[PDB]
Structure formats: C-alpha cells, structure tokens
Amino acid sequence: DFAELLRPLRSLSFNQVVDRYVLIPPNHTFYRNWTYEKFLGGFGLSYLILRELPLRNFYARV
Amino acid sequence: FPDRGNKRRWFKNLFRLIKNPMGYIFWKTYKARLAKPSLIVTSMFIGFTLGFIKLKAQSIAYSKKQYA
C-alpha cells in the first residue's frame, strides 16, 4: 500500500511530476466556495420541501 | 387525581411560539396593548433597549480584542 501511493509517480519523470502536480497554471477565477454554498445551502432548500409534509398532526411535524 | 388536561402545556406553548412567534405574541399581549403609552414612553423603551443591545455588541467585540 505504501508502494501503491507512489503508483502515479513511477510512470513519470521528475520534470513531468513538477509540471503535473507542482506547477499548476494559476487560475483564480473559480468559485471554489461553491462546494460549501451547495452543502450548507441545501439545509434551506430541504426546509422548503420539508415544511410541506402532509403529516396531519401538528406535533408530529414538531 | 391531578389535572391531566394541563399535561405538557409548557411544551405546546413553546412550539406554537416557534410556529408563529408574532401571531403568538400578538394575541397573548392583545388585552395589555389596549392601553397604549405615549410616543415618548414608547420611544424610551426602544431607545434604551437598542442602546443596551448596542453596548452588548461592543462588549462582545472587546472580548475578541482580549482574545487576540
């Protein structure tokens, strides 16, 4: 398993490793925080659907 | 026997307050609000309440200064 962690490196040279994983071209235009906005924002969207539960008893929905 | 009709009454009023807080507060205070004080008294209530909340926020911000 320690040799499996280095599997994608054995097929590459050092120059290819640096260009592949180290020298990623700079691009600061992405909305990186969309991952959190989708996750935490899902609580509000889930509430919009959940506030319509056809459970007749009020205390059941409580 | 006790009055079993009053069971869990504090929970039920809590959930009704969460369901519609302004509707619960409105009707629970209707007869009391029939006597309305002057504009001065009402303004002093809001002025002193928001002033106390403003100082509370400044005390919270000072606690972050002491933590730093």
Place this chain on the structure above:
Amino acid sequence: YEDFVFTTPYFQPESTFKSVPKLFSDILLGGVEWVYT
C-alpha cells in the same frame, strides 16, 4: 578602608568629563493601544 574591604575595579577619573548631549524624548500618558475595536 576603616577595617573593611570593598572590592571595586580601577576607577577611571576621565569618565567625569564625558560629553553626553541631551536628546529629546517625550512621554505621552494616554496614547495608542495595539488593537482597537
């Protein structure tokens, strides 16, 4: 001295006429803190 030994290094009398020009330095009781709110 009078039945007493007080060990001190060799005193330099030339240190008396040491030109020490006074420099400005003002203390402000009531100034700036590190952080503010």
Place this chain on the structure above:
Amino acid sequence: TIFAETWEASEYQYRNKANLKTLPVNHLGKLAELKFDFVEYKAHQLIACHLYERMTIHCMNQYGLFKDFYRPECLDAQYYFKTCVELNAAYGIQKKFFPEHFVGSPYARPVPQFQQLGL
C-alpha cells in the same frame, strides 16, 4: 535526547514562561482500543513516542492505508506518533540550546557567587 524510559515532568516545564503544554508519558489506554489481536511487550511502552509507532505498524499490518485504516483507533495512533516526535524534537532542541528556560536548570535563576555579595 532522553536516554531513559522516564523523565521528570517538571524538567520540561518552563520557569519564566507560562506553561501551556506538558510532555506526558505514552497513553497506554490507547493500546486497548485496538480490537484485533497483537503481540506487544511491556519493555517497549515507556520509551517516548515509540508505542504510538508500534500501534501504527500493527494497524497498517492488520488494515491497509485505504478505507480500512480510516477508523478512530488507528488514526489517533498515527496522529499521536507524528505529534509526539514533533514535540519531542522541539523540546529536545530547546533543551540543548535553551537549557535555562526549564525548571531545574541552575541558569534559569542563577545563584550569585559569594564575591558578588560584598561581605
């Protein structure tokens, strides 16, 4: 480098600085959290940071490094081992080049020579 199994807890406490960390002995209770069977000798559990390393090897032998090693008892062993050798390397260097920072050092608060008392 500590050349024993045990060390004085106060010898690694600061004298002129606030004490916000300790250098505790190896947490032997974490060894009983491993559910699988293993052989561990008591003669290796006291030396600093080594028990956590042997636990990590036992966990990396029973399980691998993917989706089976990621269990609370095995990740804490790897985290404690990594953290232990990092603190001990820092306290060891501070013990070598800053011996006067710790309680018990004669240079933390130097006692004067008798010639300095003027008697």
Place this chain on the structure above:
Amino acid sequence: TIFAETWEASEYQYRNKANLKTLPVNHLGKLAELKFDFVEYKAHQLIACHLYERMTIHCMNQYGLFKDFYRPECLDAQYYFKTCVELNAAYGIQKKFFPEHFVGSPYARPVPQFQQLGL
C-alpha cells in the same frame, strides 16, 4: 539641583515605572487668594518651591502663628512649601543616583554599540 526657572516635565517622569506623580510648576493661582496687600516680583515666582516660601512669610508677617494664621489660604501655602521641598529633595537625589529611571536619559534604554550587532 535644578539650575533654572523651568524644567522639562517629561524629564522627571519615570520610563520603566508607573507615573503616579508629577513635578508641577508653582501654583500661581494660590498667590491671588491672599486677602491682604503684599509686594511680589514676577522674577521670583518660577523658581521651584520659593513662591510658596514667600507666601508663607507674607502670611506669617500679616498674621502670627496662633489663631490668625489658621486660615485656608495660609495653611495651604505652608503645606505646599513643606511638600514641595520634600518632593524636590527626593527627585533631586533620584536624579543624581538613579538617572536611568527617567525619560530622556540615555541609560533608561541603552542603545548598543555597533560592535554588538555582529555585522
């Protein structure tokens, strides 16, 4: 000993200690509280503690020392004169044997020689 009429207030403030007292100039306003007539020259009012001394003499010449000198304007003049010469004697000795305690002294926070910087 101060060899002038005026002194820098900051030179008698401590640098490494809390400043709980100052060495203020003569309180010229107390000179106007004397009800009687007297002759005072402006050339004598700035030198330290001397105005309070002359006020005491003027009060002890107009009144005596019994039941007439005991008025608020005369007792404050004698108290200020006694307190002023006590504070100045203490500050004078502290200026002579502890010059490093005050703001403006080159020994309060010594600047190192260039040979100590290792460049």
Place this chain on the structure above:
Amino acid sequence: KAPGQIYAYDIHNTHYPYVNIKQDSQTQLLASFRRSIASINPFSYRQVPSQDRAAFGLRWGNAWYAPNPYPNGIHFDRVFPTHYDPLAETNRTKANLQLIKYAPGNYSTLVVTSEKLPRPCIRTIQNYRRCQMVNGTEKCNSEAQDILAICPNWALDHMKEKVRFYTKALAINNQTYIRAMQVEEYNQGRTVADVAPKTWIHGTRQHLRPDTMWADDRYTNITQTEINEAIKRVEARKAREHEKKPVEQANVNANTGEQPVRVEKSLYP
C-alpha cells in the same frame, strides 16, 4: 485549460470518496451506497480538493471528524479541583463552563519563529554589507550610523540578542564536538585500519544475535540436566567475582530540610 488536480485525486480517481470514520453498520452502508451514486447524486459533496472546487474534511456520522488532541495536562479549574488526567480516558471529555478549561491549541505543535525586521532597517544592513565588501570596514562609519539611527530600538535589541544566542549555540556545538571527538579508553591507538569490513546490516538480528534467550533456536535443545550443570559452573566463577563488592556511599539527601540532589533513581522501589 482544465482545472488542476492534486496528487490525491490520482490515488482515488474520484472527487467523492465517502469516507466516514464512524465504524457502525448504518454509517458504512450509507457511505457505500452514496459512494456509488455520487456521479448522479445532487446531494454529493467533495472530500478531495481541486483548483476549481474546495472540499470537506473527513466525516464523522453527520458531524465532522478531527483526531483527539494530543494529551495535555494543562487545564484551569472553575469550581473545584478536578485533577484532570489526559491519560485516564480515551477521548477527551468536553469542557463545561463550571468544571474546566483546557489549554490552548487543541491541534498545535512547538516551533521557533522570528520577527521580520522593518524594510528600511533591512536596506541599511544591505547598504553596510555591500559597502563593506567593496570599500572595507574602515570606510563604512556613515553606513553603520544609518543602521543605529533608522532601525528602531527594538530591532537593534533583536540584532544584539542574535549575536549572543549564536555565541551560546556555538559553544554548545563545540562542546558536543569535544565529547564526540574524545578518544575513549577502549579505542586507544586504534585507527581506520582496525575497523572491520562490516556495514549496518552486519549488526542486525540476522547476523548479530540479540541478548535474549529466544531470539533464535540456539537454546531450544537445552535439557534440564544441562541447566543444572550450568548453574554449577556459573557458581564456580562467582567464587572469584563475588570477592569484591563496592562500598556503600553516604546519603547526600539525608537532611529533608535541604534541597535534595536529583540522584539516579533506583531501578526498583
């Protein structure tokens, strides 16, 4: 112009490895099902970061995972002395307001740091060093005065202390040199010619037997009769070794009203 991927992505080949540390059947079953539908699941969250999208940490049930903070005995009591022992429990109990406050830095290590001297103070040092290597030290008084004037006094105190620390560290490294380069009594007259042609492997378990009786099968054929005969021989040698015994030394820690010496503790109570 595709977004860059970190090295961890090539290990897992997916951005959605549903890794949950809580080892219960309900959690791992739901994680395996969510791991399979992550391509078409709108309720999918990344745990492998990328250049274009951030990611979440390791999950613990519905909450998030973080290892137990390394055991620390420092704490602060509120109502009564709790005698907190970080080694008495597996997981650290939460700090209640009326019970305890733990030390700062749940996840923190000890490092050495340094302040950065002001830029104008740095420029004066570069000017002095440059003027020194070109014109010599004797013609750099003005540049030396600019350092004493422009650099704030705290910076000059830091510069003064660095020289004193590195003087201390120099003496410590040289005392280690003397102890290391000291020729012991068992190496008198021995040079590199007396060294054996052995490497690190020649001192390991395969070539050098450890000092334990069951490291290998060396003593597995020893019968009880040979043991009794050995006890006789080891007692015969003791007729010459037991003749001498070191003398008992005086107790330097006799007076309990005196600061005791940190003497070597006895092996056994």
